[PDB]
Amino acid sequence: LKDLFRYIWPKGNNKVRIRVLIALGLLISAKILNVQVPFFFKQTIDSMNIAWDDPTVALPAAIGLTILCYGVARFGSVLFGELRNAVFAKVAQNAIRTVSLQTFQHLMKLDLGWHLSRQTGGLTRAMDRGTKGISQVLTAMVFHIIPISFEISVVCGILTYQFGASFAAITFSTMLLYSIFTIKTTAWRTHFRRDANKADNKAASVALDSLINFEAVKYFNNEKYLADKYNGSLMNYRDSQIKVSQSLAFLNSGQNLIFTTALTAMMYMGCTGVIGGNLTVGDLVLINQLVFQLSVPLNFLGSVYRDLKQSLIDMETLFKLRKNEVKIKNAERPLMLPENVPYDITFENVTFGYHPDRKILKNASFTIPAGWKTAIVGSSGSGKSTILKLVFRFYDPESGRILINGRDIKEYDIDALRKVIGVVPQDTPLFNDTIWENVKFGRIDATDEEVITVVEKAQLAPLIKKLPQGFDTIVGERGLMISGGEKQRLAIARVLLKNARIMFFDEATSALDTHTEQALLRTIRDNFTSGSRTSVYIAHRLRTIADADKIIVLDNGRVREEGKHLELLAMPGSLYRELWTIQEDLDHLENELKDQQELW
Amino acid sequence: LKDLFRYIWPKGNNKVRIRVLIALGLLISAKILNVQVPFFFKQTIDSMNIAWDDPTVALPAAIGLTILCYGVARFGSVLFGELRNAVFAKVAQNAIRTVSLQTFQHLMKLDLGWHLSRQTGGLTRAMDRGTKGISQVLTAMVFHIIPISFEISVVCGILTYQFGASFAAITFSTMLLYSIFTIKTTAWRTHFRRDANKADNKAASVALDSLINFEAVKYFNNEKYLADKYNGSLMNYRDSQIKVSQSLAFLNSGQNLIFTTALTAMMYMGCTGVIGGNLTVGDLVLINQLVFQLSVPLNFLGSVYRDLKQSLIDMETLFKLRKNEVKIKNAERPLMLPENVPYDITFENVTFGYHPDRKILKNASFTIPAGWKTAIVGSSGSGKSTILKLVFRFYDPESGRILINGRDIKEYDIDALRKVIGVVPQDTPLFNDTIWENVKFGRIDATDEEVITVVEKAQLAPLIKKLPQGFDTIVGERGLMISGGEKQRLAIARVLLKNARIMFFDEATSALDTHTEQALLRTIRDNFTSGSRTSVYIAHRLRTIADADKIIVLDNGRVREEGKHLELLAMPGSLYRELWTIQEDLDHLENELKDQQELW
Ligand SMILES: CCCCCCCC/C=C\CCCCCCCC(=O)O[C@H](COC(=O)CCCCCCCCCCC)COP(=O)(O)OCCN
Ligand SMILES: CCCCCCCC/C=C\CCCCCCCC(=O)O[C@H](COC(=O)CCCCCCCCCCC)COP(=O)(O)OCCN
């Protein structure tokens, strides 16, 4: 909770400290007035208790002022309460915004392993729950607990000074009883609510499972059994809600019984004190009204405490996400790439594996030269979908040297590297947003003319104008769903916008159509063919790897051989030959079977 | 709303009428006491306002009784309120149960078209919303509206008889003002809450779309843009909640201002009436306390009215689902099948189509003889997945005669028919329940020994004992997910339990493995081969249709020819030949390509 008091009382920002002190003053004055009200009511009652001789005179001003003060005190108490609410909301929402944004800025900075291990739904639920918890905690600790505590103290002091300690004793005892009673009975009612929600979700699941499969529900005549299961679940839910209502009745009745006993006993004490000439009827009114005022705001407090501990747990969970440490950090003396010459990714004595038990890439030592569209190939598990993650600095090498331009990779700024490293991923994503925004994603700092030029260069205009809304469609799960080729050309356009020196085509064409694959390859070779773009195809369908100036083969996480397609295909025993023959026969059978299918 | 007053005041059930009258009596007495309380307080104040001469006497009993009556009246008012709540809950939940069950009993009785047109999520949401609406309507119309109306009337009568009409005028005017103010300001606050929820869902969607695609968020360095979108959405949400809190402050402050003006003006009227020797200070107390009691329960009522109209709309929607009419009804003079001889499904001059525009099955006239495992075959759209729906009486024939045993189908009881008509559907369903229950589904009135015998006959025991929990696994979407063959043998076991005379295998093997298909066929031919089970295979893979005694071919929704496999395959020009050759070459290429794949 300390970090919370750090987000609402920081070091340096005076605006927030002042807003908080103002909320404090408003709270204090609100309670002062809520307690002064009865005193004006009593001064009224004790100024009217005279023997009026002339029943035609006007109301003296000494009493009109008292009545007016009574009214303005009521109004001012409630008003200051609500103003405190408004102000401290202005504060708590700033705190929530700040913490959520700092957390999200961290997550975008952690390593990848910490994201692949953990679940995303869990992270989002944690953020939401911790935020609601901060809100509820500040609420219940400024709106319901601190004010009522101040009021109880003021009331006990009033009743101890004016009349005696007996009233303060009775009031504090009543408060203790009310509190513990409410807490325990609320636990009880929570058990009942849990049971009810369970038995309602059950019935809903049954109704669903029965209406979706109506055909099978009727193919066997089993509709009465379903109605009976539904009746049983509904009866359980009925009984549970019955018990919930009865328990709420017990709760409210017991609370009112407690406060009624307090008020009645205090009326008796005041009525036996009046006999001693000490007090006056106005004092009975004062006591009853003070205690009832104490009673008014206690329902809410007794309710909220139920939720405070879960909210504190959620807050701790959330605040924990920013305590995690980053392993991939900008090593000392960050630099900037030469950014004036071609680039290389020469490896040296590399050894890397996700989990330290099963190494995937072993003693690899190869060379990605300058301006030569190298091609990696192997098996899924032979360490070819990992070169990217290892050059993009998502992980580090275990006793390995990722040498770029004769200089290690752990010496540059991770961002100065990731900014000149572009990728065409296998299954590109699409945010729940437009298609113009998802393509601006490549370089937000772009002019719309550049965006349209690249969208046309990627052969996408025929597919964007074909849609209902021009450049404003809604893509993603929560919207339109386009197929593979479109997504791949979209990712290609993103890359075109990035305009990087080194490109990694991570299986751009994994599961698509033959002619769509050929179109993608044609576009890629028409755009990414200059002699100033180090290209690297992480491919497993050699049908596309024919023009590369260096083909690297990885078996059992080790480099085997190099050379051009025709060069090594003619070499005895090379895996290139077996793989090529297998893929060729596979494509033969594939296209033949597809022709047969479209026949049928 | 009338039907509601029919479900809580039926004709014949005296228990419910009596429970309701008791709730009524409790409500009335609760308000009587909540209004008598101040009179005891005033009798107290006006009995203590004496000149006590001996300040050592005890409290007379004439005042102790008054104080005790005051306390028991408070407690009894609240107690009767809560008892009314409990009782009318005991009633409303019975009503909810009854209406939900009757609705679900109807849906299981409607035709199929009404289910295929409409959406299931919509039906379930409608049921849930209408149920919550019934609950909320009864609540707000027995707990918040009727009681406060009775109390306002009683208060106006009291203040009109005892003192004068001015107080009743002020009180009723105050109530009008409070009501309309609360309504309008609540509409306002609802607008603000809508905006806030929108801008929070937006931010959550952004966080999701950014954490799921973290790889692509980093492959382009676009994390600051994401943080900025998040900051913008969070700022909108912040401002919206600020305005919500300020508006709630305005609301509560205005309400308290209204009631404060009422109380203060009434104190002034009472204090200028006391001058006329008419009233006494106790009357000022009486007035203030009565009006404050009126004020206490009004927040809730002012809130709920927001939700009452949507709830009435939901109730009407729900109650509408039982007004729909059934077209497939048990025609006059329902009968029972002979149930002592083999069965036939001889058609005659049939003509049927889902939508009257595009007929699918035209002038069909064929014969499904007794004990002959007939086989239908054609194209998906040639009218072969419809013979079932038309013999199972999910639809009716347009100028067609579905003759069974020389007698029409519209003459028997739909259930006496559906009970001797079993089906093995293509994609069988699985409820979110066990595997022993989903197999008991076939015949709930079965002995566990029969269930296990058939589960073994279906060659399923190897697949039920292979799982963690024996006969108690959790299947379905919300649980374990088994593959095709298991589901098909499960549906087969269901049928085995039904033990019907006529069976329809509706593409039992559509998309499975070769050996799994052969195993399913072997099981089916081992079980369903007796000479007393009219079998009908609605199949499109003739590789299984070789042993049937009658193969029917449907082209363009018309019967073409008949005969045994070898009989018509040797016939010139028969579609059987083309289809057989195509499927054979297709299976050849399929298995060859699969061998090639498992090579690679
Ligand atoms: C999180 C926990 C924090 C706990 C902090 C609680 C501290 C409060 C403790 C004790 C306060 C009790 C003081 C009451 C003494 C009684 C004085 C009194 O009776 O005066 C009342 C009105 O005062 C009034 O209106 C009573 C209100 C006066 C209270 C002022 C103290 C607050 C100052 C701010 C403290 C941060 C009027 O009485 P009268 O008949 O008009 O004349 C009597 C003499 N003038
Ligand atoms: C959905 C809308 C339905 C609207 C129906 C509302 C009908 C109510 C209309 C008028 C009722 C006003 C009657 C009050 C007359 C005043 C009588 C009165 O002052 O008696 C009060 C207590 O009575 C009391 O405690 C006051 C409560 C008595 C009320 C009894 C009437 C209810 C009967 C049930 C009706 C269904 C005590 O006054 P006291 O000083 O002790 O002596 C005066 C004479 N005994």
Coordinates of N, CA and C and ligand atoms in Angstrom, one line a residue, chain B residues 28 31-33 35-36 39 42-43 145-146 149-150 153-158 161-162, ligand 2:
Chain B
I28 N -47.9 -2.7 4.7 CA -48.8 -1.7 5.3 C -48.4 -1.4 6.7
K31 N -45.2 0.6 7.1 CA -45.3 2.0 7.0 C -46.1 2.7 8.1
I32 N -47.1 2.0 8.6 CA -47.9 2.5 9.7 C -46.9 2.7 10.9
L33 N -46.0 1.8 11.1 CA -45.0 2.0 12.2 C -44.0 3.0 12.0
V35 N -44.4 5.6 10.5 CA -45.0 6.8 10.6 C -45.5 7.1 12.1
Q36 N -45.7 6.0 12.9 CA -46.1 6.2 14.3 C -44.9 6.5 15.2
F39 N -44.5 10.0 16.5 CA -45.6 10.4 17.5 C -45.2 9.9 18.9
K42 N -42.5 12.4 20.0 CA -43.1 13.7 20.4 C -43.8 13.5 21.8
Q43 N -44.5 12.4 22.0 CA -45.2 12.2 23.3 C -44.1 12.2 24.4
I145 N -41.7 1.6 -4.9 CA -42.8 2.4 -5.5 C -44.0 2.4 -4.7
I146 N -44.6 1.2 -4.6 CA -45.9 1.1 -3.8 C -45.6 1.5 -2.3
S149 N -45.2 5.4 -2.1 CA -46.5 6.0 -2.4 C -47.4 6.0 -1.3
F150 N -47.6 4.8 -0.7 CA -48.4 4.7 0.5 C -47.9 5.6 1.6
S153 N -48.7 9.3 0.8 CA -50.1 9.6 1.1 C -50.4 9.7 2.6
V154 N -49.9 8.7 3.4 CA -50.1 8.8 4.8 C -49.5 10.1 5.4
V155 N -48.3 10.5 4.9 CA -47.7 11.7 5.5 C -48.5 12.9 5.1
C156 N -49.0 13.0 3.9 CA -49.8 14.2 3.5 C -51.1 14.2 4.3
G157 N -51.7 13.0 4.6 CA -52.9 13.0 5.4 C -52.6 13.4 6.8
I158 N -51.5 12.9 7.4 CA -51.1 13.3 8.8 C -51.0 14.8 8.9
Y161 N -54.3 16.7 8.5 CA -55.2 16.6 9.6 C -54.7 17.4 10.8
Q162 N -53.5 17.0 11.3 CA -53.0 17.5 12.5 C -52.8 19.0 12.4
Ligands
LIG2 C1 -50.8 2.7 -4.4 C2 -51.4 3.9 -3.8 C3 -52.3 3.6 -2.6 C4 -52.7 4.8 -1.8 C5 -53.4 4.5 -0.5 C6 -53.1 5.5 0.5 C7 -54.3 5.6 1.5 C8 -53.9 6.5 2.7 C9 -54.7 7.8 2.7 C10 -54.9 8.5 3.8 C11 -54.4 8.0 5.2 C12 -54.2 9.2 6.1 C13 -54.9 9.0 7.4 C14 -54.2 9.7 8.5 C15 -55.2 10.5 9.4 C16 -54.5 11.1 10.6 C17 -54.8 10.2 11.9 C18 -53.8 10.5 12.9 O1 -53.3 11.6 13.0 O2 -53.5 9.5 13.8 C19 -52.1 9.5 14.2 C20 -51.5 8.1 14.0 O3 -52.1 7.5 12.9 C21 -51.3 6.8 12.0 O4 -50.5 6.1 12.5 C22 -51.3 7.1 10.5 C23 -51.4 5.8 9.7 C24 -52.8 5.4 9.5 C25 -53.1 5.0 8.1 C26 -54.1 3.9 8.0 C27 -54.7 3.8 6.6 C28 -54.1 2.6 5.8 C29 -55.2 1.5 5.8 C30 -54.8 0.5 4.7 C31 -55.1 1.1 3.3 C32 -54.9 0.0 2.2 C33 -52.0 9.7 15.7 O5 -52.5 11.0 16.0 P1 -52.8 11.4 17.6 O6 -52.2 12.7 18.0 O7 -52.2 10.3 18.5 O8 -54.4 11.4 17.8 C34 -55.2 12.0 16.8 C35 -56.6 11.3 16.8 N1 -56.4 9.9 17.3

